[PDB]
């Protein structure tokens, strides 16, 4: 057969694969074994998870490969699951009415992990042998050594229950090894004050970079002359009570931009941002991003607008405002709970001044209670913020409640009803009033179906 000309053992060896056999590797024609390599992820050392990293730099829009695996139908796969205990849909791709399962046979694509914020690649439907298949396309220019991240385009509660918020910098080196490689840039100091937002107390030994010490001393990074640039996002290494460094799976580290956004150093925030700091860098366990820490500081610190400036700068630098917490609540969901009506309207006005491509992408997200951003405002009796959100997107009901797919329409109707369930007569009356005065031209049938 022509298979006899494909030695998968050399492919597995060069790609650094150590958990597959020769007969279980299914290669394809567009597989670029020269551009990537399969390595380990120290954050996933307990579960034994691996990942796909870049051996060399890769431009944006480059073909990586095809998701290969065992072929099943939608009914045959359910039968296999029901007949084989222990089988799971973790490696299952539902494409073209077929299921490609890589739980036992696959290629290099099976090692790409999940990310719904820092995804640097995506799945695209293509054709092979006149059959529908899926391919991996890079969405951004990849730097050699970074980990590839992708969006599985599917939701499961177990994911948001204990999926580590992954960053491209998360590699195979441990904390001790990473410090050993960059011992020249790290000094061991003690915490001068307390930090509730980072679980640090006074006197706690912390290994930090010079940029970190400058940020902690409320100094200005611009006033310093010789500042190295490689340690831009080199994080703060915490030291345990046994005088040994806490690992990534043991504690959550943070970057200088995180502490800067939490403290309100607007000028240092701008310096870090313009010096290539990952504005979408997330904590592993908690998932806190610069925007969440900025909101926390806004809620805590008495002076308010100083964090509004940081939020405006982040939006101006096209930060991904679609991040969410483990409660499936986005940045807007939590921001409507911590910002006053005026500052909330100011942030909405910032996003309006940016004028995004599609506004409906901000409303398609739902929380654990199946409430979008408007339903969230109406569940907490935040009527004015819901009004300004409707002012942003006036076609909210026209597109989501009055479309062709009656299923989505009825789902949104029932979600809004479940949200306004715990209302009294006065709140329902003012809600229907504000709906009618809004000039959104709402037909009477929905006004009746809503309640």
């Amino acid at each position: 057969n022509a298979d006899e000309w494909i030695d998968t053992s050399k492919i597995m060896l060069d790609l650094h694969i150590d958990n597959m056999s020769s007969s279980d590797y299914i290669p394809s024609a567009i597989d670029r074994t020269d551009l990537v390599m399969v390595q380990s992820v120290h954050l996933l050392r307990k579960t034994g998870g691996r990942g796909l990293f870049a051996r060399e730099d890769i431009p944006k829009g480059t073909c990586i490969g095809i998701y290969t695996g065992e072929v099943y139908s939608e009914q045959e796969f359910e039968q296999y699951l029901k007949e084989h205990v222990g089988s799971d849909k973790s490696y299952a791709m539902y494409v073209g009415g077929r299921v490609i399962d890589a739980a036992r046979k696959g290629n290099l694509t099976r090692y790409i992990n999940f990310s719904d914020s820092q995804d640097n690649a995506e799945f695209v439907e293509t054709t092979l042998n006149r059959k529908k298949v899926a391919k991996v396309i890079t969405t951004k220019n990849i730097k050699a050594g970074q980990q590839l991240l992708i969006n599985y385009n599917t939701y499961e509660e177990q994911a948001s229950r204990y999926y580590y918020f992954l960053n491209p910098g998360d590699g195979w080196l441990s904390a001790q090894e990473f410090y050993q490689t960059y011992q020249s840039q790290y000094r061991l100091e003690q915490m001068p004050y307390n930090l509730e937002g980072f679980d640090l107390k006074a006197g706690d030994r912390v290994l930090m970079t010079q940029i970190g010490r400058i940020i902690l001393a409320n100094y200005s990074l611009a006033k310093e002359q010789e500042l190295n640039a490689s340690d831009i996002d080199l994080p703060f290494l915490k030291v345990g009570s046994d005088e040994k460094i806490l690992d990534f799976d043991e504690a959550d580290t943070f970057t200088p931009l995180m502490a800067a956004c939490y403290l309100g150093q607007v000028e240092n925030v701008k310096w870090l941002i313009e010096h290539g700091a990952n504005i979408d860098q997330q904590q592993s366990h908690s998932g806190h991003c610069p925007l969440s820490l900025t909101l926390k500081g806004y809620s805590l610190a008495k002076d308010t607008q100083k964090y509004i400036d940081i939020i405006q700068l982040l939006i101006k630098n096209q930060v991904n405002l679609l991040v969410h917490d483990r409660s499936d609540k986005t940045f807007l969901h939590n921001a409507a709970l911590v910002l006053n009506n005026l500052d909330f309207q100011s942030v909405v006005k910032f996003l309006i001044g940016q004028n995004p491509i599609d506004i409906n992408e901000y409303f398609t997200y739902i929380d654990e209670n199946d409430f979008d951003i408007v339903m969230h405002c109406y569940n907490n009796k935040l009527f004015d913020k819901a009004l300004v959100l409707l002012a942003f997107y006036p076609d909210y009901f026209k597109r989501n409640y009055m479309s062709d797919n009656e299923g989505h329409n009825q789902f949104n109707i029932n979600a809004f009803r479940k949200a306004i369930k715990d209302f009294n007569s006065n709140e329902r009356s003012i809600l229907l009033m504000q709906l009618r005065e809004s000039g959104l031209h709402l037909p009477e049938d929905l006004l009746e179906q809503l309640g």
């Binding site: 299952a92 791709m93 799945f123 599985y152 385009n153 948001s160 997200y365 739902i366 989501n400």
Partner: peptide
């Protein structure tokens, strides 16, 4: 990833 459309292609 919990959108109104609660691996896959897209």
């Amino acid at each position: 990833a919990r959108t109104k459309q609660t691996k896959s292609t897209g």
